[PDB]
Symmetry: C3
Subunit: 115 residues, 3 copies
Amino acid sequence: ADALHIRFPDGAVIEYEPETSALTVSGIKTASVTASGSVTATVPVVMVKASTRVTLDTPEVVCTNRLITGTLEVQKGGTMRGNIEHTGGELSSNGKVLHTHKHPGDSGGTTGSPL
Amino acid sequence: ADALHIRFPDGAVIEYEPETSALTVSGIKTASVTASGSVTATVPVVMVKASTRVTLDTPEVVCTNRLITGTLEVQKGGTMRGNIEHTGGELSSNGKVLHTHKHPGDSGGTTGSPL
Amino acid sequence: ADALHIRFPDGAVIEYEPETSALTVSGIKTASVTASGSVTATVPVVMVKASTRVTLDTPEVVCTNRLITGTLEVQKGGTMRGNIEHTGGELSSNGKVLHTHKHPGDSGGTTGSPL
Ligand SMILES: [Ca+2]
Ligand SMILES: [Cl-]
Ligand SMILES: [Fe+3]
Ligand code: NA
Ligand code: NA
Ligand code: NA
């Protein structure tokens, strides 16, 4: 056909509105999509507003350019290439702080912090 | 109308079940959505269970709060702010290990590792 | 029923093609899905091709295994565990470079860079 406009007894909406070219699904509890090949979305802007969590349960997540986050937790290691510029706190490894650490010196005293 | 309940000859299902408020798409090979503006999902929990890969092919991925990963690979650099606490292995740069590295000292010997 | 094949006056397509088991939504401007519980996608490959941005506006994004990115920006700190191997530039914290930094030594001179 030529239309999609559904109002359900639970208050859900599933429709397409060609005047504004808007596909709307609202008022549902769950959605799922199960496919054997691929799911693709091609659009300038993707917004996911998830008040609990977004889980990407996969061997690999690839971000092709920039990734921005508030906090980061890495569990099992990694690699980094390129200039990595840390500021605004301490970058420590096993308690040793990059910008402030000292060493025993070579003649019995202590070095200063990094120059 | 008021219902959406489709069973296809390939075994796929596309339906909405208002008793449980559940939208189900199953038994398909591929899905795609192509839009000129935006795609938005607003829901407490998003689960993506992808046995091969999730690719976010975009100039920028933004996580507004926490990001947790198993391993991390950064290809082209970055910035970090705030306290970054590494433990449980070596944090190295060009082979130099933050928590264990030593230097030639200022009078001919070698420093100890970081205090 | 047993079919889903819609052509709209704006040129949009919403259909399922059982010959190839392909669900297609195309030629739209916006889509949104609003749910009170969860949205789940289970499929080997997820592709998001977003010419402006992907935003995960959530307390927590979890990648269960590998995360790969071009650049990284961490705004508010974090933790890292496991071996983290940086190469191919400078890893600095508050201007102090892991692989090249020096210290005042313990007898009035300057240390060398890391061994
Ligand atoms: Ca000395
Ligand atoms: Cl010294
Ligand atoms: Fe040092
Ligand atoms: Na530490
Ligand atoms: Na290294
Ligand atoms: Na720095």
